[PDB]
Amino acid sequence: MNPKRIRALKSGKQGDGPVVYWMSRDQRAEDNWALLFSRAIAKEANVPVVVVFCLTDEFLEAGIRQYEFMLKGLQELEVSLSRKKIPSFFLRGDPGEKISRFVKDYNAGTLVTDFSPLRIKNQWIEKVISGISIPFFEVDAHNVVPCWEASQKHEYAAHTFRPKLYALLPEFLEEFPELEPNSVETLSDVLETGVKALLPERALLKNKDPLFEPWHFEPGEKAAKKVMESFIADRLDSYGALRNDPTKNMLSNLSPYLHFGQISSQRVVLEVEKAESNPGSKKAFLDEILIWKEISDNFCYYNPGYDGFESFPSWAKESLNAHRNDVRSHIYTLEEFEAGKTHDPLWNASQMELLSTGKMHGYTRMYWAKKILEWSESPEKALEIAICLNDRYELDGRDPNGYAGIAWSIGGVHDRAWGEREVTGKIRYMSYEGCKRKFDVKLYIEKYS
């Protein structure tokens, strides 16, 4: 149990009641440093550990697709935790008000939460800190190397972050100890009432049939493990060669599970390290799930304006500014982008993959966001549109990887300058013709009519 994974958010007077783990980002019972640390603190204090989860007022900003995925996962989690004699409490409302009251009502001794660098989590932490008198800790349960340890600053490139992270893997890549058992309404009801509130905004085909197909990704810890196991057995050997081909299903498909914390990336890395596969494919995959994922936490943690133009590198701000008044080839509205009504069939197909499955292939996500910049009035408007659509329709959205990936695509964050073009300046350009040279674009379009 490495103390560098835990940080104090508030010093206080420890009460004599249970240790409370305010679960938010890491919705799993296994392989969860925040839960393991909470259990250990409870044991030292001779008290039980309890889990509290807040169903917040912002769920109406996304869709049924994410709400059902998350809640079905929590139904399974409640059962798993209760098998370890760990009670779970699901609070409906504002974390500031609901967690503060719970701590007081239940005489909590200590409060622990998991780590997210997103602004909304910081908003909740501020409100909770001002309403409690007990000690408050946060644990990085999402990254292999704690975010505040991997680097002390924003890293401008994968190649500056990569040796810092790999230097620390020997310390922080380790097996998990087993979770020791201990010595306010039904989730089915919350899901029903929330779905009924979301129904008017469900994405529909003109037929009135819903667009979303829920059968592509089954939610929960158990299903996540099966996805990991099948990736290692069936897809890892080809990952290096085929990861950029959206006509093949050769990615891990782990991002929805990783986003909600239904599986630990440290677990995935342990299992991939011990698998014998193509060394090139293993290297490629580890670069994505270690370097690119954890540098996205680095980006959001050290850049308070991670969702704005101000966080782009200076070379990219200067270049995009120099091309602000260039005439754009096309300008689409939010609603035209949302419905896949551009002139570009590959763009529209990528949007239909997103609408129907909730998970756009990683290669076309790059293409998709870069064309929003090309066909938007300004870089700021492009950022707003890409974030809006990514977060509304991706199962893995509302995530540091989403803000960092959009910033990479539109603002060159973690990229370098390329040849200068009109409108997009020196931001890496991705052409339709260049995609045709790299995969069977007609097959991807035919699949997503």
Ligand SMILES: Cc1cc2nc3c(=O)[nH]c(=O)nc-3n(C[C@H](O)[C@H](O)[C@H](O)COP(=O)(O)OP(=O)(O)OC[C@H]3O[C@@H](n4cnc5c(N)ncnc54)[C@H](O)[C@@H]3O)c2cc1C
């Ligand atoms: C415009 C844009 C928006 C994106 N939005 C999100 C998002 O909202 N949520 C999200 O989790 N990822 C996002 N990404 C990153 C990436 O596209 C997805 O993580 C990946 O496609 C998920 O599919 P997978 O798990 O099957 O991928 P695999 O290729 O199997 O990768 C394994 C994991 O590595 C990580 N990873 C892979 N590529 C990236 C990357 N470019 N940046 C950061 N981490 C990466 C992810 O954790 C991923 O699950 C975005 C990328 C772009 C260009």
